[PDB]
Design a protein around this ligand. Structure first.
Ligand code: BB2
Ligand code: BB2
Ligand code: CL
Ligand code: CL
Ligand code: CL
Ligand code: ZN
Ligand code: ZN
Lengths: 172, 172
């Protein structure tokens, strides 16, 4: 299991929608394994396949301990072909960063709770009922699968400032 | 010297531009005195006259200790009829709240350094050269004089969320 390079803004791969996984087979499991290693090496709570250059609907999460039926933390989760099955109308503001926008943090308003159907590492059907930071991570990761980085939720001026910040740090 | 009530969003008084002070006289000094007391009672770093219902170009600041020629902190400052005379092209992201949007904090990008000409408590001409939190406060206060609250710099979705948050807290 190996550490993959993270794709960072403004790389256009990050704005491309990822495709459903046809079949959860050995090759998918190998990628998931590399995703977990990469997530850990980067001190992340989650990671989407697109962030390592693969446009497939696969994300991993692990949210450490620090509504009945919902989880505040947990993992490791392998979440393939996620489908949102319930989502709270109540929303909360929390601070986020992203491995694809290194060093930049800002506030984002999202639903507090979410339920998602998915296929696991073995290709079995599952539901996750998440709240708190678990729900927050899951939504951030699902957005990546749809070609969305969290800067999309900010003013244009701040989004541009964040992208210029990352560009300046990567200029050769 | 008395504590004045703070005008909060979405009160439309906060979106009205304030008028130049004609003359810094006893009545202006009395208002400034009440502004300092109100600022302190509310644990603020600054305050604009519009926030206490008076549409005049007067702000106060006091930024405690915690470029050559620029100050990182200081006060108490009485700043009347401010005019920006220099402003840095470099900008910085810092977290702000506002007494007129109670309980809501977010990130704002602003110039790091500013120089402002103004009239003081005695009606004498002065310049302030500010950086760090002093410059940050001064710009936040100047915005109020122009009818601008810091939510203006946010996404519409987050601005609306903040205003609904304050409205819900004030609903009778
Ligand atoms: C919170 C919503 C998203 C979490 C997932 C991201 C990782 C990522 O970009 N996944 O796509 C992360 O770990 N971000 C971290 C992050 O945002 N954290 C970690 C602690 C809490 C929160 C910052 O408030 C750091 C590494 C930037
Ligand atoms: C920082 C830019 C503006 C400072 C002035 C405001 C007060 C205000 O609304 N003036 O118009 C303030 O004191 N805000 C505080 C504030 O934003 N602070 C105080 C410590 C640092 C910073 C939060 O990061 C709290 C009381 C909400
Ligand atoms: Cl920053
Ligand atoms: Cl909030
Ligand atoms: Cl924003
Ligand atoms: Zn991310
Ligand atoms: Zn304010």
């Amino acid at each position: 299991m190996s550490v993959l390079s993270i794709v960072t803004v403004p790389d256009k791969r990050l704005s491309l929608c990822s495709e459903e996984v046809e079949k959860v087979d050995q090759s998918i499991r190998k990628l998931v394994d590399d995703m977990f290693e990469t997530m850990h090496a980067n001190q992340g709570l989650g990671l989407a396949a697109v962030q390592v250059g693969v446009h497939k609907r696969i994300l991993v999460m692990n949210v450490p301990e620090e509504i009945e039926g919902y989880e505040l933390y947990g993992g490791p989760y392998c979440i393939i072909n996620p489908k949102i099955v319930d989502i709270s109308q109540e929303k909360v503001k929390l601070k986020e960063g992203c491995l694809s926008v290194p060093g930049y943090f800002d506030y984002i308003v999202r639903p507090q709770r979410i339920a998602v159907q998915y296929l696991d590492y073995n290709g079995n059907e599952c539901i996750i009922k998440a709240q708190g930071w678990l729900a927050r991570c899951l939504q951030h990761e699902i957005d990546h699968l749809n070609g969305t980085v969290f800067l999309k939720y900010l003013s244009k001026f701040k989004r541009d400032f964040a992208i210029e910040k990352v560009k300046k740090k990567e200029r050769t």
